[PDB]
Amino acid sequence: FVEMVDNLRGKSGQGYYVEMTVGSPPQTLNILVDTGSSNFAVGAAPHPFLHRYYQRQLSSTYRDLRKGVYVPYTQGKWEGELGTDLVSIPHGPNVTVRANIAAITESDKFFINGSNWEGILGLAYAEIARPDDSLEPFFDSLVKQTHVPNLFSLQLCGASVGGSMIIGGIDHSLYTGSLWYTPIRREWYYEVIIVRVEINGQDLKMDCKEYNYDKSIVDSGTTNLRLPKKVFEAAVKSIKAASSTEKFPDGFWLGEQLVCWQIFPVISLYLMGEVTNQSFRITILPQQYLRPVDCYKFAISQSSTGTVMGAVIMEGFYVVFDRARKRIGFAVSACHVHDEFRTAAVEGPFVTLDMEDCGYN
Ligand SMILES: Cc1ccccc1-c1ccc2nc(N)c(CCC(=O)NCCC(C)(C)C)cc2c1
């Protein structure tokens, strides 16, 4: 999978995108890689922020589904017109798939001014696709129509960002040590179960249900580590404690301020393993959750929809979305940023009882 190496670009905080083609003849677009959504949606109108857009009138293979779709978010939205067309990934597998495409015709606070992408590739499952789960997501269409294996893996290496999306396989050059797998609890988001959290080696001693209150997901579309409020409150209280050599205001912890200088504690997440009463832990450095924006912001925030393992987690690990076996693999990434005193790590096995009780119902 050599030519798929380094097929991801982007800017800090603006997500990772991959090059794709749509229609016949092929129209090239940069498309965000997003494991937290399930729609393949592309700009189709000359929005002033867009470098380019889907021009359906130029594609002989375009087919109109004659149905709109409306996707609101927190004060933002995009909406579009559903259709199908031929889709390829130039630095991916050598195949061409007919996939659903949502031609974005109206949006608000969706496209980013100054960014270099024009659409979004939802890699999650049909259940959270809009308008309903009958709109087959792209990767499902890819797997059904070709012999590409039902998995993909992501190495996000956080000016410009870089990374690799390996469609249908695993490139063992992109990680060190062994892969450790956590089960996909349910196929809608990429939902997983955190069973224990440690700050600098010290457990938070919270009922593990809180770590997954509502849910916990793996999301390449989210920048930060998003923890439930009560877990976030307890998490920052511990990170605050080990960080007494230097005192910042309270608002900096809620995402309100940056400071440069031109000692922090490591965060450990224990994930449910593949075997009863067996878990493993992934540990990230300060180089992950303190994102430069030599200045840096604090990239851990609270959430209402559960835990979100975003780029702060994924940029330290090679992550394997093993859809065929309903599991997610983690391994130390060969590109993660680390000093010479501490390293990102994936360790196991550990003994953890009542891991199923950690999931919310
Ligand atoms: C921010 C926003 C504004 C207008 C339209 C869409 C978006 C949007 C697009 C894709 C997203 N993809 C994501 N993975 C996320 C974060 C995770 C999340 O809440 N997913 C829920 C489902 C859905 C992504 C809203 C469809 C938020 C997103 C927000």
From Swiss-Prot:
The UniProt record lists the keyword Endoplasmic reticulum: yes
Where mainly located? Answer: membrane
Q: Name one GO cellular component term.
A: membrane raft
Q: What membrane topology term does the record carry?
A: Single-pass type I membrane protein
State the protein's name: Beta-secretase 1
Which cysteines link up through disulfide bonds?
Answer: 157-335, 208-358, 260-295
Give the Extracellular compartment stretches of this protein.
Answer: 1-361
Q: Where in the cell is it found?
A: Cell membrane; Golgi apparatus, trans-Golgi network; Endoplasmic reticulum; Endosome
Q: Which residues of the full protein are shown?
A: 60 to 446 of 501
> What tissue specificity is annotated for this entry?
Expressed at high levels in the brain and pancreas. In the brain, expression is highest in the substantia nigra, locus coruleus and medulla oblongata.
Residues annotated as catalytic: 34, 219
Q: Which UniProt keywords apply?
A: Acetylation, Aspartyl protease, Cell membrane, Cell projection, Cytoplasmic vesicle, Disulfide bond, Endoplasmic reticulum, Endosome, Glycoprotein, Golgi apparatus, Hydrolase, Isopeptide bond, Lipoprotein, Lysosome, Membrane, Palmitate, Phosphoprotein, Protease, Signal, Transmembrane, Transmembrane helix, Ubl conjugation, Zymogen
